[PDB]
Amino acid sequence: PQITLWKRPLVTVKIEGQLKEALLDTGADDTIFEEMNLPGRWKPIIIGGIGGFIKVRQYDQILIEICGHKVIGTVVVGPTPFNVIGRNLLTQIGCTLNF
Amino acid sequence: PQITLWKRPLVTVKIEGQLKEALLDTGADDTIFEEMNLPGRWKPIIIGGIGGFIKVRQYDQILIEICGHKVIGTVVVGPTPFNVIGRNLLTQIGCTLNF
């Protein structure tokens, strides 16, 4: 799928049996979701962005099915206004920027 | 160009005769730059992101030469960790996400 940028690049994803919409974000190193539970042992970390830094929980090898592809990787959970698919997962679907 | 996401998608830009590197951020609605001088008036505004909000200056009709393409539009100036090229200018260079 080719995606233009006239609107927010939101895709439907399935993570841990839950349906969500997440932002394909080339400016995010990492993937972060709002509150939810996930398998495995998590380490507490802190991520930073435009407005400051937030405390989040980091999970490794989480499965996300994004628009029909499958990816496994670190998924961080914490207070974000959007669900964001950082580059860690974008690489795994072979997502590129073109112009 | 085609840009993979294994590394941060930075490009060199020329804005107001200054050479800068900026992020091709599909998660950003607008464009924000570090502290600098610019032409025209500016209304003070506030942008929100991961971790809160910041006060910034908003300029209109600002020209940027991105990787040899020219675009004009609203550029925000304020305390960001990265210069960010948002959708408000990515659409003008015809930039798309592909996978």
Ligand SMILES: CC(C)CN(C[C@@H](O)[C@H](Cc1ccccc1)NC(=O)O[C@H]1CO[C@H]2OCC[C@H]21)S(=O)(=O)c1ccc(N)cc1
């Ligand atoms: C909150 C997002 C939906 C939108 N953001 C763009 C996003 O790409 C930022 C852009 C960004 C890039 C570097 C530093 C701060 C913000 N990246 C980000 O927050 O990512 C964090 C999680 O992954 C890590 O990667 C780096 C920061 C971490 S934003 O910075 O807050 C933003 C929102 C609106 C505008 N007009 C401009 C910028």
